[PDB]
């Protein structure tokens, strides 16, 4: 039972963080936006003043739920359904 | 113009982080989602082992660009414009 609306479509913190992360290309041709950049923490611990991984702290991913569009029917260029996905944005350092 | 079906299909880090943050509502009745929870860093510095703020490190917000729908024309229940907006998700600790 669809609820159809019309839609018109028209910093190196990752390296300097004490919980640094890498950026993964999440690419899905069935989704708009097709490309989402997601974070993966580099280490389990956090970097200390000497540049070493200190495992008494935890690098953890900062996540959120966001809105994307999913092609429906599949491969449709002009019709979609709303979709909620969980994504990792960056990482932070937490006390255990 | 595309067709969208509105029928959607599918960790207290903010407190324990060395760059802790606060969460506040970003609300807009003209937008889907109408409510977006955004982060503000609690301090300029980062919390050290003893629990004090160390200004030799900076708390910085981790931001990303996300998809929202804005009613077009205003107040329309079934007509939208795709928008890209910058949001603050959480905070991390970076070295100068
Ligand atoms: C800032 C920019 N963002 C992006 O292009 C996308 C933009 C998504 C978008 C497209 C069209 C309309 C509305 C929104 N947003 C995301 O990728 C995203 C959001 C969250 Cl939330 C997480 Cl997680 N990822 C970017 C480029 N980048 C290149 C390399 C590494 N990172 C990079 N980010
Ligand atoms: C995890 C949850 N998220 C959320 O309900 C929303 C969900 C957004 C959404 C709605 C409908 C369809 C698809 C997506 N997403 C966001 O709020 C959001 C995304 C980014 Cl990116 C930043 Cl920034 N904010 C939540 C509740 N919360 C209550 C208090 C404090 N934090 C909270 N988070």
B23 inside domain: yes
C-beta atoms of A62 and B13 within 8 A:
yes
Q: Which distant-in-sequence residues (6+ apart) come within 8 Å of A76 by Cβ?
A: none
Structural domain contains residue B4: no
Alpha-carbon distance of B39 to B31, in angstroms, equals 19
Resolution (A): 1.8
DSSP H or E run through A47? strand A46-47
**Measured distance CA(A33)–CA(A27) in Å, rounded:** 9
Kindly state whether residue A15 falls inside one of the protein's structural domains.
no
Instruction: Tell me which ligand sits closest to the C-alpha of residue A67.
Output: 2
Looking at the 3D structure of chain B, how many domains does it have? 1
Which 3 state secondary structure label does DSSP give A16? helix
Residue B94 tokens read as 């970076």
User: Residue A51 is part of a domain; what is its CATH number?
Assistant: 2.10.90.10
Tokens of A68: 């994307």
For every residue of A29-46, DSSP letters joined together read TTEESSEEEEEEES-SSE
Residue A60 domain flag: yes
CA dist A88 and B20 (Å) reads 17
Ligand 1, atom 4, residue with closest C-alpha: B65
* Residue B6: inside a domain: no
Q: Which residue has the tokens 């200004």?
A: B55
- Domain assignment present for residue A49? The answer is yes
Tell me if B67 and A62 make a contact (CB, 8 A cut-off). no
Task: List B residues 2-41 in contact with A (Cβ-Cβ < 8 A).
Answer: 2-11, 13, 16-19, 32-33, 37
Are B80 and B93 in contact, with CB atoms under 8 Å apart?
A: no
Q: Which domain holds residue A90?
A: 39-69+76-96
Q: How far apart are CA A68 and CA A37, in angstroms?
A: 13
Tell me whether residue A17 is in a domain. no
Element (H, E) at B14: helix B13-16
Per-residue tokens: B5: 């079906």
| Dihedral angle computed from the Cα positions of residues B11, B17, B22 and B23, in that order, rounded to the nearest 10 degrees | -30
Question: Is A35 in contact with A27 (CB distance < 8 Å)?
Answer: yes
Nearest to B42 by CA among B22, B57, B58, B14: B22
In a domain, A55, yes or no: yes
Q: How many residues does chain A have?
A: 96
d(CA B18, CA B13): 9
């Amino acid at each position: 039972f669809p609820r159809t609306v019309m839609v018109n479509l028209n910093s190196d913190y990752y390296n300097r963080s004490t919980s640094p992360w890498n950026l993964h290309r999440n690419e899905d041709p069935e989704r708009y936006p097709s490309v989402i950049w997601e974070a993966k923490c580099r280490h389990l611990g956090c970097i200390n003043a000497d540049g070493n991984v200190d495992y008494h702290m935890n690098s953890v991913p900062i996540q959120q739920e966001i809105l994307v569009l999913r092609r429906e029917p599949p491969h449709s260029p002009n019709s979609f359904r709303l979709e909620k996905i969980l994504v990792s944005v960056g990482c932070t350092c937490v006390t255990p």
